[PDB]
């Protein structure tokens, strides 16, 4: 989305240890400016998590964005591998 509007999908508490907060966030990855980078987790009907909260370094994040494989967040990847 553009300008000032529905950005709530970005400012959720993506996981129990979510460190991203609308009131304090600043860019970290080279690809960020005013919004946190996110990754789609294929668990169940799927959900989005903050890349930063998954403790992913930039190169890993970039590889994920370029690949066609499914991603499972730290909370669900173990269930997916079982």
């Amino acid at each position: 989305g553009p300008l000032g509007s529905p950005e709530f999908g970005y400012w959720i508490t993506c996981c129990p240890t979510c460190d991203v907060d609308i009131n304090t966030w600043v860019p970290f990855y080279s690809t960020e400016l005013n919004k946190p980078a996110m990754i789609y987790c294929s668990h169940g009907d799927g959900h989005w998590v903050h890349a930063q909260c998954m403790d992913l370094e930039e190169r890993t994040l970039i590889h994920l964005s370029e690949g066609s494989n499914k991603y499972y967040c730290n909370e669900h990847v173990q269930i997916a591998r079982a």
């Binding site: 970005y10 990855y29 080279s30 690809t31 960020e32 400016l33 919004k35 946190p36 980078a37 996110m38 990754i39 789609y40 294929s42 989005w48 890349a51 994040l61 970039i62 994920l64 964005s65 690949g67 066609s68 494989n69 499914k70 991603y71």
Partner: peptide
């Protein structure tokens, strides 16, 4: 995987 805000700066 699908991602948001990952376009090269």
């Amino acid at each position: 995987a699908r991602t948001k805000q990952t376009a090269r700066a």
